Amino acid sequence: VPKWIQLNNEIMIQKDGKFQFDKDKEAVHSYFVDYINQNTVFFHNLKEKLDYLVENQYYEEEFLSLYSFEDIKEVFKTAYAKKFRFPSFMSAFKFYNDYALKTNDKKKILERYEDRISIVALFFANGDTEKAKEYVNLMINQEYQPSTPTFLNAGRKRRGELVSCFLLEVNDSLNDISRAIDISMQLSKLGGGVSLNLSKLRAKGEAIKDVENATKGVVGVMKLLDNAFRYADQMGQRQGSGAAYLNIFHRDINDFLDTKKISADEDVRVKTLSIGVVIPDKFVELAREDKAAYVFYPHTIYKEYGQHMDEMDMNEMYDKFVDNPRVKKEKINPRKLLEKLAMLRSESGYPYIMFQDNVNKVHANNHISKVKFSNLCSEVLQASQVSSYTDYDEEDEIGLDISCNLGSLNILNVMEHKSIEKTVKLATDSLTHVSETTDIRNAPAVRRANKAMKSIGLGAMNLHGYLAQNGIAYESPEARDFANTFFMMVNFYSIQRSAEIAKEKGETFDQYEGSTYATGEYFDKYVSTDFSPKYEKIANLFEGMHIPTTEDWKKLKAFVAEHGMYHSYRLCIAPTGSISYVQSSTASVMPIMERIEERTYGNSKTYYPMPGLASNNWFFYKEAYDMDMFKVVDMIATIQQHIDQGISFTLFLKDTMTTRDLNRIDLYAHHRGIKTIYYARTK
């Protein structure tokens, strides 16, 4: 075994009844000295390194040409002036195995952490030396973390897309379905995950040009999408991941769920296609009263009313559909469907549960469209318009398709530096640059919506790490108070930066005037309620930082009304997975699954304690499965009220908790305002 791995295994070797947590720093030192410093290509100067990387098609030349070499050298000096040291071996291992640039033969390492960060900052700044140095300070302090696509591929020629997600609306036509397959493959080859809304597709047994019982339902389209994502497997290095979302009132909802059953035959089962279920409040009401529900055939509704099933408010039009003889449906049991959802999530973790009315109750851009579906990570909730892809040599009607411009704030490092405002504004600027520089030619709706909506996703991570390292239990009300204050601050400064960008560019996002930002309805709870901490301990955490008040929110509302808002969406909390290791952070705002992660790499067993774990804060780092899921729902809903998009909310379930417990958690999440539920992780 290697020396660093052997030293890492001494974490679990307990002496005097305590874990040898100090051995981890020795593991980082051994790892670097024995592997990294030996297998990193070193050049006589930064000029030679840059020439080698651009000439050998490792870096793009366009973004480096915006700076003189003096500016680039100063930026790299700023990155290395911090003298950043990885505090855990797993952080360095993750970076130098996944995100560090390597030679074409993968034998050596071309990029350090201070090199990847410098290149990403130079990409973000776009010719500005001071902005590049600010980004370098932001990332080397680990206050803000660009998403895995953005961090990996910024300024590199051998890349994919910096966009993490692609949310596609699939219209009810063979041409539209074929274009959905094409766009799904063209966006999977770019690396980003693709989510598709299949609620517009007509159900099984529907008519294709007045011949009845002709359709095979959305399950055939899921088969096509699953094989399309399998084909676009990105070399197999990361398997093609795709999501499919269906409204729970869609007739195919039972067959939609039947594909995730283990007992399901290979003739119906889909493997690479994750599934999500969109649940309007009407379904929850029907389940609550234990009255028979109806799943409708979408094409009958489209023929009768001229509008798609998912474009109509089901809370208002459910009765109209039911008493309509020209609308086809079959009676179902909403409580039986809820139990089926609970057991499917217990067995496989699917489907993602999207509470449509919870999303659209506080959705700012309902005028553009209601949020009909979420992304593969079940955290992006944006307005989308379907695209009517017509026959060849006929002009297509291009709609709006959602894309992830993701970035995560490290709550621990953000609040240690007392720079919530600066970090949020710089992250918003970086995400704006990523959205602007994204130009996807094979996805027309994605490109059009990226140009028009200018939506970005600014998430946060290391919530549990910050709370445990500050002596706050995740389920404690003080933790919820801190999350309320912190995410209200984040929302305030994200809105402020969006309005500042709109003022400086003279343009807002498309159809901004109809949004609640323009009408001032979005800021109602912010100008009516004070989100300052209610606990003295929590208020001390924000000391040295100006917490926005009701009057400050009124000034921000006036500023937005006068100048507009550049981004339709700004905040969405992604799961923050493999990049959380590099930032030495807990994943997302979720609680930690295990105090010490047991990971297998090759023939070695590697251990990763969560950052800041020690004897004093051992019980503050409570495992997620040990937590009360209701209090985690409370925490997320406290965070959710300050996030305009959704949060990737994973349910951590014990083996002893039945499907009724999972359904209770789901219904409490719906009752508390949770927008989406990502996963049901059973231990």
């Binding site: 234990d290 499907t659 009724r660 219904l667 009752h671």
Partner: peptide, 12 residues
């Protein structure tokens, strides 16, 4: 298990 829902799981 596969414990069914009752009327009291829909109010909190």
């Amino acid at each position: 298990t596969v414990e069914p829902l009752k009327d009291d799981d829909f109010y909190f």
